[PDB]
Structure 1
Amino acid sequence: KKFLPFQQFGRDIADTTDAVRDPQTLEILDITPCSFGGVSVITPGTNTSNQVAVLYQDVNCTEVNVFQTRAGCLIGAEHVNNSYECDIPIGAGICASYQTQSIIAYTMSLGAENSVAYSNNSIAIPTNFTISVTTEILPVSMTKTSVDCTMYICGDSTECSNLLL
């Protein structure tokens, strides 16, 4: 930074100090807050395994069987070159699953490719059909709750009730 000779420190929009002058040397220091992020646990059901993998979100694989995802440093999952349907989503195209056993992590498949046998003179016509039934579910209502605000705050209490009024 090009600090002017009068400036003891500099600050970001949050009023957090970004940089400082040292009181015992004519030097200007940048300050970067310490590396942090969500610890996310990737698990199958406890019915099926107590193995887990851990995703340290947004840290470069340093400060924590380790793999970098764009979501974070993923610890305890085996990288795979094949791709599969998603199972547990991780982020930025990465998905993980419990398969033959340990947790594997992979870029998810979108489904099979199927290039089309197109030409300006050929058509496919159905010779036969399947009638198919599909279930579709929709919620329609909640539980009709009601709450007595007065009783919730000041149960049996005239003292409280006089303060709530």
Structure 2
Amino acid sequence: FGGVSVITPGTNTSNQVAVLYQDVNCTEVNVFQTRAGCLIGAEHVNNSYECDIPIGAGICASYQTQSIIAYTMSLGAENSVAYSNNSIAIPTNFTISVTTEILPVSMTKTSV
């Protein structure tokens, strides 16, 4: 036995779904085996992308051109630093950026 989780995009986009059977092998149940369980209906892709629908154990799913794909999520673009003992990197130009940060403050004063 094991839990059943459905991986789907929004119903506005597509009605295609991907089914994950939690913490079981792909024996009793386009099949991808993960550490989180048995994934059926999602294609396996070598390429890594940003996580959209998290699954577990580094596996994330997304709806891309169309079918549901599964991949190991990327940690970001790799950027080596040209470090040496006699080189400095100093900015020559700057930009002023405005960012938006939202924090909840009040909860609805419900009296029962």
Q: Percent identity?
A: 100
Give, in whole Å, the separation in 1 of the partners of 2:47 and 2:17. 21
Choose which of 90, 93, 96 in structure 2 pairs with 1:128.
93
Q: CA deviation at 1:63?
A: 0.8
Give, in whole Å, the separation in 2 of the partners of 1:65 and 1:114. 34
Choose which of 36, 52, 63 in structure 2 pairs with 1:87.
52
Per the normalisation by structure 2, the TM-score is 0.99
- For structure 1, the 5+ residue unaligned runs are 1-35, 148-165
> What SS class does the counterpart of residue 103 from structure 1 fall into?
strand
Give, in whole Å, the separation in 2 of the partners of 1:115 and 1:54. 38
**How big is each residue's C-alpha offset from its partner over 1:5-49, in whole Å with a ceiling of 9 and x where there is no partner?**
xxxxxxxxxxxxxxxxxxxxxxxxxxxxxxx11110000100000
Q: CA deviation at 1:69?
A: 0.8
Give, in whole Å, the separation in 2 of the partners of 1:61 and 1:67. 8
Aligned length: 112
Choose which of 119, 131, 146 in structure 1 pairs with 2:84.
119
Give, in whole Å, the separation in 1 of the partners of 2:102 and 2:6. 30
Flag the structure with higher strand content: 2
Give, in whole Å, the separation in 2 of the partners of 1:74 and 1:110. 22
Point out which structure has higher relative CO (alpha carbons under 8 A, 6+ apart). Answer: 2
User: Could you tell me which residue of structure 2 aligns to residue 51 of structure 1?
Assistant: 16
> What SS class does the counterpart of residue 114 from structure 1 fall into?
coil
User: Could you tell me which residue of structure 1 aligns to residue 69 of structure 2?
Assistant: 104
Larger radius of gyration: 1
Across the aligned residues of Structure 1 and Structure 2, the Cα RMSD in angstroms comes to 0.5
Q: CA deviation at 1:65?
A: 1.4
Give, in whole Å, the separation in 2 of the partners of 1:140 and 1:60. 45
